[PDB]
Each structure stands twice: as C-alpha cells, then as structure tokens.
Amino acid sequence: EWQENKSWNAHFTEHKSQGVVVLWNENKQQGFTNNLKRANQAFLPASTFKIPNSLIALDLGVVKDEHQVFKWDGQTRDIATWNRDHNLITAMKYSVVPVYQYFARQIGEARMSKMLHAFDYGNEDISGNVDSFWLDGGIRISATEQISFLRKLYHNKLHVSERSQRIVKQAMLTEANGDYIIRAKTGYSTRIEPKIGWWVGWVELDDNVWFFAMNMDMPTSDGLGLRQAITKEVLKQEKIIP
Amino acid sequence: EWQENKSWNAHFTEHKSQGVVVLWNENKQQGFTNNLKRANQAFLPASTFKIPNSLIALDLGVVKDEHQVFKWDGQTRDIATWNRDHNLITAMKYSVVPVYQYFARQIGEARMSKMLHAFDYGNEDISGNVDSFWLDGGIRISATEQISFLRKLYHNKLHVSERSQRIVKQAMLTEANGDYIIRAKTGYSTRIEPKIGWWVGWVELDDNVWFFAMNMDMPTSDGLGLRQAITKEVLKQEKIIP
Ligand SMILES: [Cl-]
C-alpha cells in the first residue's frame, strides 16, 4: 500500500536537482514517496552494495569479524582515506572500494550469484567484472527494492547467520543520539549513466522504525552532501526526527 | 602504566562538585586519571549494573532478544518513561529499574552470584535483596574495576555467549557521528550514602578505543547532566574527541 506525496519535490527543487525518496512505516505497513515512477526505476547500486557484499563475506568466512585488518595494497588512489589499512567498520564508513573488490574476488561469481538470488536482491544479475559488477556491471535495483531487502536484514530474515546480519548492521551505524538511531549506507554511481547518488537504511525510534531509500541525479560530486540533507529534510517534514 | 592529571579537577570544580575520571588507551595499554585513589574507590554500581544484568538475562534466556516486550505492570511510578512497555533497548536507554528487578528475580541469587564471580565483577557480593542489591545491597565496584570489566565485554571475552555480548553492546549505544561512537551506561546511586552519579563505557575511533569510567558526588538530581558534560570536557582536552 503506497501513497505519493509530491510536496517533497520541493526539497529536490531548491537545489535544482531531481530524485526520489521512499519511506516505509514498519508499524503501520505503509509506504510514502514523492515519485512512484522513479521509486520503481532500477539503478546500479554502487556502494550501497557493500551491505549484501559484507553479509556474504562474513557468512562465507572471507571476513572473520569486524576487527580483521585488510592491509593497504600500497597503491595510492585519489581518495586519501582509502590509502591505509581497514577493517569492516572503517571500510564501510569510507566506502573503500578496493577492499570490497577483494571481498568479491574471494567470494567468487558462483557463490555471489547464488547468495543474491537467495537475498532476492534486485535483478540478481552479476554479469560483468566479478569484483566491480556493482559499479559497471549488470546488477540493478530500485529504491523500493532496497527497502524490501533492508527490512529482511532488520528482522534477521536473510539467508545468512544471525551473527552475520548483526555484524553488518553494526557496521551500518551512521548516527545516534537521544532521539533516534540511523543505520544506513551511501552510494555514488559514476561509471554508467545516469550518474546518481544513493542513501539507503532506516531510522530507529523507541517504538517504530522508518526504512528509507533515496536516489538523485549527481552530475558532479559537489552535491553529494545533499543525499543526507534532502532525506533529513523529508524526515523532519514528516515529524519522524526533530 | 598510569599517569595522574590533576588538571581535570577543574572541570569538577566549576560546578562545586568533585569526582574522578578514568581513561584507558587500549592500543598503548596506558591509563589516565585525575585522582588515583578515588579511581580505586568502590561504590554501589546502581544502574551501570544493567550491563552485567542484561548479559546474564540474555545468556540464560530470561530475555530472548532485544525486541521482546516487557509490559508495564500498570503501577504508576515517579519516572514518566517507566510507565510504559519496554524492550531491552528502551529499558537500558531510560534505566527502567522495575524491568531489571524482574530480570534479577528470574535469574535468582545462586546463578547471579555464579555469574558475577565468572565476570570477576567488583567485590562479587550480592548481599541484600535478590533484586535490588545493586541499589542498596553489598555489591561494590570501582571505576578501574568497571573499565576492566568493560574491556572484556568489548573483546567478547566474558563467560557468556558472543551473541549475548553483542546484543548488550548494541543496547549500550548512546551516541554516534562521523567522529566517534560512544557505548555507555549511566548510573545514579541514591539509596546509600554518598549519593553519586556514574558514567562508564568507551569511545570507538577509526584506529583506537578509549574506555572510560567516571563517578562524581551527586547530592541532588540537578547535576545529573554533568556526568556526560564533564566526561566530554576531559575527552576534548585530551584531543580524543573534537
Ligand atoms: Cl550497534
């Protein structure tokens, strides 16, 4: 049961940008979005794919725990925070692609494919480079499909161990205070058009949880901060957060 | 390896209060405090005891998971947030004593005693009410003894399941942002003199973790906010948080 609220389009308009925000009220089982069309349009997941990749890597033992260090390959890249050792927590935090390319190669195409099928994740197609298909390959997922996946994760219903799911949800921790907790993951797709930014996750309250998924046009990296800002603007408007 | 920095006493001085802050650098295995003596002075743990109590209740199945609802008994108490249903997460957040009294009674004195010895927790003494000894009974623990206990919890080395320790650490989540994560539990001892406030836990950074434990004189409930404020002033001074 979904409803369309075009009033949110304002928040995209003030920045002369466009996109979609999708919300799901878990208690009342009702969804909300500014654009039913784009809510169901499938895009490359980019770094939002770090969530299922982490789940699979943990469940298969490629990653022993959230403390295991994956040392820098010594190759200096454009993003400074990538040029150092990382564990699952910091690799998530800084979207360290090369670490997750390593995860992917260790997982392999066969097992990766099977797990994504079990997760009912997007179009379940990993055609392309084994360790970059989420950046320039065949996998596609929509905002509404992101919620469905994230809801399974929250309820520990995905086909991996409870432990693997708890660990990934820890690594998803983005913000917490006396009012709410946000567990989420950003995304930035640049290799295939249209260039877009992602933000997917949920908001924990004392007695409810609001799942969210948004994407927006991202012609340049200048507007990346708007991924979170526009989402929070919508959450505030809907009185979900102060 | 310990060092004493009396300069922190200022932060207590500005509020006509006194107390101790204890810091432990996990990477370097070095401790810091403003008062070596009071750091080793044992007090009633009060609501900081919700950490071990939670661990035991989970491991014994008294608490199935962090979602299980413990219903309000319909009795109206002085604390507004207590007069409602709670789970482990909200019970922690609001220090809901009556919930944890239930936990204790279901655990029983024999098993409770057994667990605290295994935890090597404080003086390991549960004299008093089976279900209020941490508020007005014989159990005592010092700031440094709190840290040692918390360090075990962090490393999943306590004699309970890994799952139980992960769930309690989830429930300890207090604050998170791009700079740090704080997992902690407040305490407020009023039934036995001297009345004191607690704050114990740790600060997670990208490359280190700082465990902390503080207590301070708390003649009235007016100064409760100082538990966090003073601790953070010390953290800022030592360049641990911005
Ligand atoms: Cl957490």
PDB file of N, CA, C and O in Angstrom, chain B residues 39-100:
ATOM      1  N   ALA B  39      39.830   6.652  41.889  1.00  0.00           N
ATOM      2  CA  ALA B  39      39.743   5.740  40.753  1.00  0.00           C
ATOM      3  C   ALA B  39      39.585   4.304  41.251  1.00  0.00           C
ATOM      4  O   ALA B  39      38.954   3.477  40.592  1.00  0.00           O
ATOM      5  N   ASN B  40      40.155   4.024  42.422  1.00  0.00           N
ATOM      6  CA  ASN B  40      40.114   2.686  43.005  1.00  0.00           C
ATOM      7  C   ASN B  40      39.115   2.579  44.150  1.00  0.00           C
ATOM      8  O   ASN B  40      39.031   1.540  44.801  1.00  0.00           O
ATOM      9  N   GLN B  41      38.344   3.639  44.381  1.00  0.00           N
ATOM     10  CA  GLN B  41      37.301   3.607  45.404  1.00  0.00           C
ATOM     11  C   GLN B  41      36.037   2.937  44.879  1.00  0.00           C
ATOM     12  O   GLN B  41      35.474   3.358  43.873  1.00  0.00           O
ATOM     13  N   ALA B  42      35.576   1.913  45.587  1.00  0.00           N
ATOM     14  CA  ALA B  42      34.422   1.143  45.144  1.00  0.00           C
ATOM     15  C   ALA B  42      33.128   1.726  45.697  1.00  0.00           C
ATOM     16  O   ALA B  42      33.023   2.004  46.892  1.00  0.00           O
ATOM     17  N   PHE B  43      32.154   1.906  44.808  1.00  0.00           N
ATOM     18  CA  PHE B  43      30.819   2.367  45.174  1.00  0.00           C
ATOM     19  C   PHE B  43      29.788   1.358  44.697  1.00  0.00           C
ATOM     20  O   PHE B  43      30.116   0.420  43.966  1.00  0.00           O
ATOM     21  N   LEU B  44      28.540   1.544  45.117  1.00  0.00           N
ATOM     22  CA  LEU B  44      27.434   0.800  44.535  1.00  0.00           C
ATOM     23  C   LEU B  44      27.401   1.108  43.034  1.00  0.00           C
ATOM     24  O   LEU B  44      27.611   2.253  42.636  1.00  0.00           O
ATOM     25  N   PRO B  45      27.192   0.084  42.191  1.00  0.00           N
ATOM     26  CA  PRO B  45      27.181   0.353  40.749  1.00  0.00           C
ATOM     27  C   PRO B  45      25.900   1.033  40.281  1.00  0.00           C
ATOM     28  O   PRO B  45      25.920   1.738  39.276  1.00  0.00           O
ATOM     29  N   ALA B  46      24.810   0.831  41.015  1.00  0.00           N
ATOM     30  CA  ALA B  46      23.488   1.314  40.609  1.00  0.00           C
ATOM     31  C   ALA B  46      23.163   0.858  39.177  1.00  0.00           C
ATOM     32  O   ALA B  46      23.385  -0.306  38.839  1.00  0.00           O
ATOM     33  N   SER B  47      22.671   1.767  38.333  1.00  0.00           N
ATOM     34  CA  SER B  47      22.157   1.392  37.013  1.00  0.00           C
ATOM     35  C   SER B  47      23.239   0.991  35.998  1.00  0.00           C
ATOM     36  O   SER B  47      22.919   0.492  34.912  1.00  0.00           O
ATOM     37  N   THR B  48      24.511   1.200  36.327  1.00  0.00           N
ATOM     38  CA  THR B  48      25.573   0.680  35.467  1.00  0.00           C
ATOM     39  C   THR B  48      25.570  -0.846  35.568  1.00  0.00           C
ATOM     40  O   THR B  48      26.192  -1.534  34.756  1.00  0.00           O
ATOM     41  N   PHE B  49      24.860  -1.369  36.568  1.00  0.00           N
ATOM     42  CA  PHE B  49      24.760  -2.811  36.759  1.00  0.00           C
ATOM     43  C   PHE B  49      23.811  -3.414  35.726  1.00  0.00           C
ATOM     44  O   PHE B  49      23.677  -4.635  35.630  1.00  0.00           O
ATOM     45  N   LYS B  50      23.145  -2.563  34.955  1.00  0.00           N
ATOM     46  CA  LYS B  50      22.242  -3.054  33.920  1.00  0.00           C
ATOM     47  C   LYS B  50      23.019  -3.748  32.807  1.00  0.00           C
ATOM     48  O   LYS B  50      22.460  -4.555  32.074  1.00  0.00           O
ATOM     49  N   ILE B  51      24.317  -3.467  32.710  1.00  0.00           N
ATOM     50  CA  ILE B  51      25.153  -4.119  31.704  1.00  0.00           C
ATOM     51  C   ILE B  51      25.342  -5.608  32.040  1.00  0.00           C
ATOM     52  O   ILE B  51      25.001  -6.464  31.224  1.00  0.00           O
ATOM     53  N   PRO B  52      25.903  -5.931  33.225  1.00  0.00           N
ATOM     54  CA  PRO B  52      26.030  -7.359  33.550  1.00  0.00           C
ATOM     55  C   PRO B  52      24.689  -8.067  33.703  1.00  0.00           C
ATOM     56  O   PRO B  52      24.564  -9.237  33.335  1.00  0.00           O
ATOM     57  N   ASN B  53      23.700  -7.362  34.241  1.00  0.00           N
ATOM     58  CA  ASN B  53      22.369  -7.928  34.434  1.00  0.00           C
ATOM     59  C   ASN B  53      21.767  -8.305  33.083  1.00  0.00           C
ATOM     60  O   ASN B  53      21.152  -9.361  32.940  1.00  0.00           O
ATOM     61  N   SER B  54      21.937  -7.427  32.099  1.00  0.00           N
ATOM     62  CA  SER B  54      21.480  -7.703  30.736  1.00  0.00           C
ATOM     63  C   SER B  54      22.186  -8.921  30.152  1.00  0.00           C
ATOM     64  O   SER B  54      21.549  -9.795  29.574  1.00  0.00           O
ATOM     65  N   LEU B  55      23.501  -8.986  30.335  1.00  0.00           N
ATOM     66  CA  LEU B  55      24.295 -10.086  29.798  1.00  0.00           C
ATOM     67  C   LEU B  55      23.798 -11.430  30.300  1.00  0.00           C
ATOM     68  O   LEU B  55      23.616 -12.366  29.521  1.00  0.00           O
ATOM     69  N   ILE B  56      23.571 -11.507  31.607  1.00  0.00           N
ATOM     70  CA  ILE B  56      23.159 -12.746  32.249  1.00  0.00           C
ATOM     71  C   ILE B  56      21.746 -13.144  31.837  1.00  0.00           C
ATOM     72  O   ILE B  56      21.482 -14.309  31.551  1.00  0.00           O
ATOM     73  N   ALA B  57      20.839 -12.174  31.810  1.00  0.00           N
ATOM     74  CA  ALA B  57      19.451 -12.447  31.463  1.00  0.00           C
ATOM     75  C   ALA B  57      19.339 -12.973  30.032  1.00  0.00           C
ATOM     76  O   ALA B  57      18.544 -13.868  29.748  1.00  0.00           O
ATOM     77  N   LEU B  58      20.154 -12.427  29.139  1.00  0.00           N
ATOM     78  CA  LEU B  58      20.161 -12.860  27.751  1.00  0.00           C
ATOM     79  C   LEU B  58      20.722 -14.272  27.637  1.00  0.00           C
ATOM     80  O   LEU B  58      20.161 -15.123  26.946  1.00  0.00           O
ATOM     81  N   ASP B  59      21.831 -14.519  28.321  1.00  0.00           N
ATOM     82  CA  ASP B  59      22.515 -15.797  28.202  1.00  0.00           C
ATOM     83  C   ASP B  59      21.700 -16.931  28.824  1.00  0.00           C
ATOM     84  O   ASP B  59      21.842 -18.087  28.427  1.00  0.00           O
ATOM     85  N   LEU B  60      20.849 -16.597  29.794  1.00  0.00           N
ATOM     86  CA  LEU B  60      20.018 -17.598  30.465  1.00  0.00           C
ATOM     87  C   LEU B  60      18.650 -17.728  29.806  1.00  0.00           C
ATOM     88  O   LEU B  60      17.862 -18.603  30.164  1.00  0.00           O
ATOM     89  N   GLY B  61      18.378 -16.859  28.839  1.00  0.00           N
ATOM     90  CA  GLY B  61      17.143 -16.921  28.085  1.00  0.00           C
ATOM     91  C   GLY B  61      16.002 -16.201  28.774  1.00  0.00           C
ATOM     92  O   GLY B  61      14.861 -16.265  28.318  1.00  0.00           O
ATOM     93  N   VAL B  62      16.304 -15.510  29.870  1.00  0.00           N
ATOM     94  CA  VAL B  62      15.299 -14.702  30.550  1.00  0.00           C
ATOM     95  C   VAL B  62      14.835 -13.612  29.594  1.00  0.00           C
ATOM     96  O   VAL B  62      13.669 -13.209  29.606  1.00  0.00           O
ATOM     97  N   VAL B  63      15.768 -13.141  28.774  1.00  0.00           N
ATOM     98  CA  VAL B  63      15.480 -12.213  27.690  1.00  0.00           C
ATOM     99  C   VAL B  63      15.820 -12.895  26.370  1.00  0.00           C
ATOM    100  O   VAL B  63      16.979 -13.226  26.120  1.00  0.00           O
ATOM    101  N   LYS B  64      14.816 -13.105  25.526  1.00  0.00           N
ATOM    102  CA  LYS B  64      15.027 -13.825  24.275  1.00  0.00           C
ATOM    103  C   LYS B  64      15.876 -13.014  23.298  1.00  0.00           C
ATOM    104  O   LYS B  64      16.876 -13.513  22.779  1.00  0.00           O
ATOM    105  N   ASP B  65      15.492 -11.758  23.076  1.00  0.00           N
ATOM    106  CA  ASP B  65      16.264 -10.848  22.230  1.00  0.00           C
ATOM    107  C   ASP B  65      15.954  -9.389  22.558  1.00  0.00           C
ATOM    108  O   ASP B  65      15.212  -9.106  23.493  1.00  0.00           O
ATOM    109  N   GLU B  66      16.504  -8.466  21.771  1.00  0.00           N
ATOM    110  CA  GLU B  66      16.369  -7.045  22.064  1.00  0.00           C
ATOM    111  C   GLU B  66      14.988  -6.485  21.721  1.00  0.00           C
ATOM    112  O   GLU B  66      14.721  -5.307  21.982  1.00  0.00           O
ATOM    113  N   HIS B  67      14.119  -7.332  21.160  1.00  0.00           N
ATOM    114  CA  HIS B  67      12.773  -6.936  20.732  1.00  0.00           C
ATOM    115  C   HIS B  67      11.664  -7.343  21.707  1.00  0.00           C
ATOM    116  O   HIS B  67      10.588  -6.745  21.703  1.00  0.00           O
ATOM    117  N   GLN B  68      11.920  -8.364  22.520  1.00  0.00           N
ATOM    118  CA  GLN B  68      10.920  -8.880  23.453  1.00  0.00           C
ATOM    119  C   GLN B  68      10.342  -7.749  24.290  1.00  0.00           C
ATOM    120  O   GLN B  68      11.080  -6.909  24.806  1.00  0.00           O
ATOM    121  N   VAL B  69       9.017  -7.723  24.401  1.00  0.00           N
ATOM    122  CA  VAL B  69       8.327  -6.665  25.122  1.00  0.00           C
ATOM    123  C   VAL B  69       8.054  -7.090  26.557  1.00  0.00           C
ATOM    124  O   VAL B  69       7.505  -8.159  26.806  1.00  0.00           O
ATOM    125  N   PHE B  70       8.457  -6.235  27.488  1.00  0.00           N
ATOM    126  CA  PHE B  70       8.154  -6.404  28.904  1.00  0.00           C
ATOM    127  C   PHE B  70       7.136  -5.344  29.307  1.00  0.00           C
ATOM    128  O   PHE B  70       7.459  -4.163  29.423  1.00  0.00           O
ATOM    129  N   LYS B  71       5.895  -5.780  29.490  1.00  0.00           N
ATOM    130  CA  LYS B  71       4.770  -4.867  29.619  1.00  0.00           C
ATOM    131  C   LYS B  71       4.751  -4.104  30.939  1.00  0.00           C
ATOM    132  O   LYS B  71       5.174  -4.617  31.973  1.00  0.00           O
ATOM    133  N   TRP B  72       4.278  -2.862  30.876  1.00  0.00           N
ATOM    134  CA  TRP B  72       4.046  -2.052  32.065  1.00  0.00           C
ATOM    135  C   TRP B  72       3.102  -2.794  33.009  1.00  0.00           C
ATOM    136  O   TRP B  72       2.092  -3.344  32.565  1.00  0.00           O
ATOM    137  N   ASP B  73       3.422  -2.823  34.301  1.00  0.00           N
ATOM    138  CA  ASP B  73       2.580  -3.533  35.266  1.00  0.00           C
ATOM    139  C   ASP B  73       1.383  -2.691  35.717  1.00  0.00           C
ATOM    140  O   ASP B  73       0.651  -3.085  36.621  1.00  0.00           O
ATOM    141  N   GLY B  74       1.195  -1.533  35.093  1.00  0.00           N
ATOM    142  CA  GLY B  74       0.053  -0.682  35.389  1.00  0.00           C
ATOM    143  C   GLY B  74       0.236   0.196  36.617  1.00  0.00           C
ATOM    144  O   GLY B  74      -0.594   1.067  36.889  1.00  0.00           O
ATOM    145  N   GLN B  75       1.311  -0.040  37.367  1.00  0.00           N
ATOM    146  CA  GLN B  75       1.627   0.771  38.540  1.00  0.00           C
ATOM    147  C   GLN B  75       2.388   2.035  38.140  1.00  0.00           C
ATOM    148  O   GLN B  75       3.455   1.967  37.522  1.00  0.00           O
ATOM    149  N   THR B  76       1.814   3.189  38.472  1.00  0.00           N
ATOM    150  CA  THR B  76       2.392   4.480  38.114  1.00  0.00           C
ATOM    151  C   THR B  76       3.522   4.874  39.060  1.00  0.00           C
ATOM    152  O   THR B  76       3.329   4.947  40.273  1.00  0.00           O
ATOM    153  N   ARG B  77       4.697   5.136  38.491  1.00  0.00           N
ATOM    154  CA  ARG B  77       5.876   5.494  39.273  1.00  0.00           C
ATOM    155  C   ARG B  77       6.318   6.923  38.967  1.00  0.00           C
ATOM    156  O   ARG B  77       5.774   7.571  38.069  1.00  0.00           O
ATOM    157  N   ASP B  78       7.315   7.399  39.710  1.00  0.00           N
ATOM    158  CA  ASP B  78       7.729   8.798  39.657  1.00  0.00           C
ATOM    159  C   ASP B  78       8.370   9.128  38.322  1.00  0.00           C
ATOM    160  O   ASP B  78       8.350  10.277  37.886  1.00  0.00           O
ATOM    161  N   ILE B  79       8.940   8.116  37.671  1.00  0.00           N
ATOM    162  CA  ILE B  79       9.595   8.325  36.391  1.00  0.00           C
ATOM    163  C   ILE B  79       8.618   8.036  35.257  1.00  0.00           C
ATOM    164  O   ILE B  79       8.144   6.913  35.096  1.00  0.00           O
ATOM    165  N   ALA B  80       8.322   9.076  34.484  1.00  0.00           N
ATOM    166  CA  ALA B  80       7.296   9.015  33.450  1.00  0.00           C
ATOM    167  C   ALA B  80       7.607   7.957  32.391  1.00  0.00           C
ATOM    168  O   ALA B  80       6.721   7.221  31.957  1.00  0.00           O
ATOM    169  N   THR B  81       8.867   7.897  31.966  1.00  0.00           N
ATOM    170  CA  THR B  81       9.274   6.967  30.917  1.00  0.00           C
ATOM    171  C   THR B  81       9.221   5.507  31.368  1.00  0.00           C
ATOM    172  O   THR B  81       9.352   4.606  30.544  1.00  0.00           O
ATOM    173  N   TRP B  82       9.070   5.273  32.671  1.00  0.00           N
ATOM    174  CA  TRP B  82       8.949   3.910  33.193  1.00  0.00           C
ATOM    175  C   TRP B  82       7.537   3.346  33.069  1.00  0.00           C
ATOM    176  O   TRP B  82       7.352   2.129  33.087  1.00  0.00           O
ATOM    177  N   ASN B  83       6.543   4.223  32.942  1.00  0.00           N
ATOM    178  CA  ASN B  83       5.147   3.789  32.939  1.00  0.00           C
ATOM    179  C   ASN B  83       4.673   3.481  31.529  1.00  0.00           C
ATOM    180  O   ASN B  83       3.724   4.078  31.023  1.00  0.00           O
ATOM    181  N   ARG B  84       5.358   2.533  30.904  1.00  0.00           N
ATOM    182  CA  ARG B  84       5.039   2.108  29.553  1.00  0.00           C
ATOM    183  C   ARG B  84       5.751   0.793  29.275  1.00  0.00           C
ATOM    184  O   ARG B  84       6.585   0.352  30.074  1.00  0.00           O
ATOM    185  N   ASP B  85       5.423   0.164  28.148  1.00  0.00           N
ATOM    186  CA  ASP B  85       6.088  -1.072  27.760  1.00  0.00           C
ATOM    187  C   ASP B  85       7.523  -0.759  27.358  1.00  0.00           C
ATOM    188  O   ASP B  85       7.819   0.351  26.919  1.00  0.00           O
ATOM    189  N   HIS B  86       8.411  -1.734  27.529  1.00  0.00           N
ATOM    190  CA  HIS B  86       9.814  -1.571  27.161  1.00  0.00           C
ATOM    191  C   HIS B  86      10.388  -2.851  26.584  1.00  0.00           C
ATOM    192  O   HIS B  86       9.889  -3.941  26.857  1.00  0.00           O
ATOM    193  N   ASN B  87      11.423  -2.705  25.763  1.00  0.00           N
ATOM    194  CA  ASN B  87      12.296  -3.817  25.420  1.00  0.00           C
ATOM    195  C   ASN B  87      13.668  -3.548  26.033  1.00  0.00           C
ATOM    196  O   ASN B  87      13.842  -2.568  26.761  1.00  0.00           O
ATOM    197  N   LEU B  88      14.635  -4.414  25.749  1.00  0.00           N
ATOM    198  CA  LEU B  88      15.963  -4.282  26.337  1.00  0.00           C
ATOM    199  C   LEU B  88      16.595  -2.950  25.952  1.00  0.00           C
ATOM    200  O   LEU B  88      17.288  -2.329  26.756  1.00  0.00           O
ATOM    201  N   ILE B  89      16.350  -2.511  24.721  1.00  0.00           N
ATOM    202  CA  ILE B  89      16.976  -1.295  24.215  1.00  0.00           C
ATOM    203  C   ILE B  89      16.443  -0.062  24.940  1.00  0.00           C
ATOM    204  O   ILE B  89      17.217   0.791  25.381  1.00  0.00           O
ATOM    205  N   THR B  90      15.123   0.030  25.064  1.00  0.00           N
ATOM    206  CA  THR B  90      14.493   1.180  25.710  1.00  0.00           C
ATOM    207  C   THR B  90      14.635   1.130  27.229  1.00  0.00           C
ATOM    208  O   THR B  90      14.739   2.170  27.888  1.00  0.00           O
ATOM    209  N   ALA B  91      14.648  -0.076  27.787  1.00  0.00           N
ATOM    210  CA  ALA B  91      14.850  -0.239  29.226  1.00  0.00           C
ATOM    211  C   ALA B  91      16.231   0.265  29.631  1.00  0.00           C
ATOM    212  O   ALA B  91      16.395   0.889  30.681  1.00  0.00           O
ATOM    213  N   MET B  92      17.226  -0.020  28.800  1.00  0.00           N
ATOM    214  CA  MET B  92      18.573   0.496  29.014  1.00  0.00           C
ATOM    215  C   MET B  92      18.581   2.011  28.919  1.00  0.00           C
ATOM    216  O   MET B  92      19.049   2.704  29.826  1.00  0.00           O
ATOM    217  N   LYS B  93      18.057   2.503  27.801  1.00  0.00           N
ATOM    218  CA  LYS B  93      18.029   3.925  27.485  1.00  0.00           C
ATOM    219  C   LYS B  93      17.439   4.767  28.616  1.00  0.00           C
ATOM    220  O   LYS B  93      17.951   5.848  28.916  1.00  0.00           O
ATOM    221  N   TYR B  94      16.372   4.265  29.238  1.00  0.00           N
ATOM    222  CA  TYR B  94      15.653   5.003  30.281  1.00  0.00           C
ATOM    223  C   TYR B  94      15.882   4.454  31.698  1.00  0.00           C
ATOM    224  O   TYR B  94      15.162   4.828  32.629  1.00  0.00           O
ATOM    225  N   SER B  95      16.883   3.587  31.853  1.00  0.00           N
ATOM    226  CA  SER B  95      17.217   2.985  33.151  1.00  0.00           C
ATOM    227  C   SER B  95      15.982   2.491  33.900  1.00  0.00           C
ATOM    228  O   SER B  95      15.762   2.845  35.061  1.00  0.00           O
ATOM    229  N   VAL B  96      15.189   1.651  33.246  1.00  0.00           N
ATOM    230  CA  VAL B  96      13.925   1.216  33.821  1.00  0.00           C
ATOM    231  C   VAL B  96      14.167   0.135  34.873  1.00  0.00           C
ATOM    232  O   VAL B  96      14.181  -1.057  34.570  1.00  0.00           O
ATOM    233  N   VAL B  97      14.350   0.574  36.115  1.00  0.00           N
ATOM    234  CA  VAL B  97      14.651  -0.316  37.238  1.00  0.00           C
ATOM    235  C   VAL B  97      13.703  -1.514  37.372  1.00  0.00           C
ATOM    236  O   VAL B  97      14.168  -2.647  37.480  1.00  0.00           O
ATOM    237  N   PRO B  98      12.377  -1.276  37.364  1.00  0.00           N
ATOM    238  CA  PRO B  98      11.464  -2.399  37.615  1.00  0.00           C
ATOM    239  C   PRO B  98      11.611  -3.542  36.616  1.00  0.00           C
ATOM    240  O   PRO B  98      11.327  -4.691  36.961  1.00  0.00           O
ATOM    241  N   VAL B  99      12.048  -3.231  35.400  1.00  0.00           N
ATOM    242  CA  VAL B  99      12.294  -4.257  34.393  1.00  0.00           C
ATOM    243  C   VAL B  99      13.447  -5.150  34.821  1.00  0.00           C
ATOM    244  O   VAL B  99      13.382  -6.374  34.696  1.00  0.00           O
ATOM    245  N   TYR B 100      14.499  -4.527  35.341  1.00  0.00           N
ATOM    246  CA  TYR B 100      15.706  -5.248  35.708  1.00  0.00           C
ATOM    247  C   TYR B 100      15.575  -5.946  37.053  1.00  0.00           C
ATOM    248  O   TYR B 100      16.356  -6.847  37.368  1.00  0.00           O
TER     249      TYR B 100
END
